[model samples]
Target: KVFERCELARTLKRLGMDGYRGISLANWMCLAKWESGYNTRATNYNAGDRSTDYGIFQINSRYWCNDGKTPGAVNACHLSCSALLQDNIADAVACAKRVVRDPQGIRAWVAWRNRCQNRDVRQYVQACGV
Candidate 1:
C-alpha cells in the first residue's frame, strides 16, 4: 500500500503469486488495480446487502472473513477483515490462495470476473518482469 506498483509486484512475487498455485501475478495485479487501487486500507460497503469489502484484496467480510462486527458471517477464512487492511498482507494472501482453490476459483472475486478474467492482464506487471 505504501509502496508503488513495482514494489507491490516485487513483494507479491516473493509471496509466490508471480506464478504460483495455478495463478499468475499479472492477473492478480490487474485485479488489485481495479478492486482496491493498491490501497491497503480500502473498504467498500456494498449497496443493498450492507456487506463491506476490505483491504488491497478487497476481501468480503460476508463470506471470506469476519469484520468483528458482522453477525452470522460465513467467515470461511476465519480471519479478521482488519487483518487484510494492514501493511502486511500475508494473512490475506494465504486466505486468498484458499479462495482461489475453492469451487469458485478466481470467480470468487467479482472485479476479477468482470474485468481481469478472459483478458490479457500481463501488461499490468510487464515492466516489473514478474
Candidate 2:
C-alpha cells in the first residue's frame, strides 16, 4: 500500500523511530520517501548482484534479509526478504532498526546519503504533529 506522507510519518513515530539509533524520525521519513515512496510492497531487483531490495525501507537481500536467491547472502536481520514486503510495517520497521545498529547507521541506505544527510530533513515531519 502507498501511504500518505503524514500517515507514514505518524506511523513511524508510533513505531519508535523518533530517536532510535540517534537517527531522527524525519531522517527515517526521508529515507522512506526516497527509498520506496512509502509503498510497503516496493521491490527493486539488482540484476548486477542478483539481489533485491524490499519494502518501505528498501531492506536488501544481499546482507540484510534473505530471498534465498542472492549469492553469498548473510541474512543479518534473520528474516525472509518477503517479511519486508508486508503491508503491515511492524516487521519492516523492526528490520530498519536492526540495520542502523551497525556502525553505518542510516548511511546503510545510499538514498539517505544522497538525499537526506545533512539537509533540512525536518521538513519531512513538519506540521505532521509527530
Candidate 3:
C-alpha cells in the first residue's frame, strides 16, 4: 500500500492539503519523503527507548498511536498503532492533521526542519497533476 509520490500527491490535493491552512503541498511531500519514503507500512522502532513510528507520516507512538509497549505514550490520536500500517491511509492523515494543528504545526516533524525548512520543495508535486 505504499504510495507512489504522484499518487500520494493527488490524494493529498483531493484532501485539501495542497494549500490548506498555510500548509503547502511541498511541505507535505517533503515530510512524507523523509518520514517513510511514502511507505504505508513503515515502522521505526528506534532502540533509544523502543518507541515506534508508524506509517507514511511516521506518527510516533510516543504521542499518537498506542501499541501497548510504547511507554509513556499519550495516544492522542486514539488509534491502535497497527491501524496506521493498514492499507487505507485516511486514518493516518486524520491523525497527522491533528498533529499539524498543535502548537508546533508541521515543526512536529523534525525531518521538515532538517531538510525542508527553507527549501523549494514544490518540485515534489509540480508534475503530479495536482
Candidate 4:
C-alpha cells in the first residue's frame, strides 16, 4: 500500500494534533503497517466473519461508528476510512488525539516497544515540550 505519510502528517497538524507530532513518523507508519498495512480499503476477517473495519486507519465500525463516542461518531465509518472524507482534518485528528490523551497517553502504543521505560503519557508530553 502506498502510505501517504506526509499528507497524513499535514492533516494531523492542520487539525492541531500536536500530541502525535513528537511521535516518530516511522512509528506511525509502523503502526499503520501492522494495523492495516496502509490499505485504506482493508477490513478485518476472522473465522469467516467480517469485522467491517476499513481504511488506512483501520477504524472499527463498532467502536467508532455505532458507539457514538467520537466527534463524528454519527459517521464513524466514513471518517475512519479516509481522513479526506471529513469536512476537515480536525475531526479525525481530534479523535486520534483524544485516544492518545485518554487511556493513559498511548500506553498501548508504548507497550509495543516491549519496555516499561516510557509508560507515562504525561511525562512523555512534558519531555516533548508540549
Q: Top model by TM-score, which number?
A: 2
**36-109 in candidate 3: lDDT tens per residue?**
99998999888998899999899999899889997777899999999899877888888888888898998999
Q: Which wins on lDDT, candidate 1 or candidate 3? A: 3
Estimate, for each residue in 1-130, the C-alpha lDDT of model 1 and write its tens digit. Answer: 6557878888888888766567788888887888888888889887767688988888988888887666567888888887888888788788888788787777788889899999988778878856
Candidate 4 residue-wise lDDT, 1-130, digit = tens: 3445455544444556544735543344444445555455555533333334544444554444442333333443334444522434354445545445555554434323543323333322222222
Ranking by lDDT: 2, 3, 1, 4
lDDT of 2 by residue, 20-121 (tens): 989899999999999999999999988899999999999999898988899998998899998998889999999999999999999999999999998999
Winner by lDDT: 2
Stretches of model 1 off by over 4 angstroms after superposition: none
Alpha carbon lDDT of each predicted model: 0.82, 0.93, 0.88, 0.44
Winner of 2 and 4 under TM-score = 2
Each candidate's TM vs. the true structure?
Answer: 0.91, 0.97, 0.94, 0.46
Which pairs of residues collide in candidate 3?
Answer: none
State the lDDT at 14 in candidate 1. Answer: 87
Clashes of 2: 0
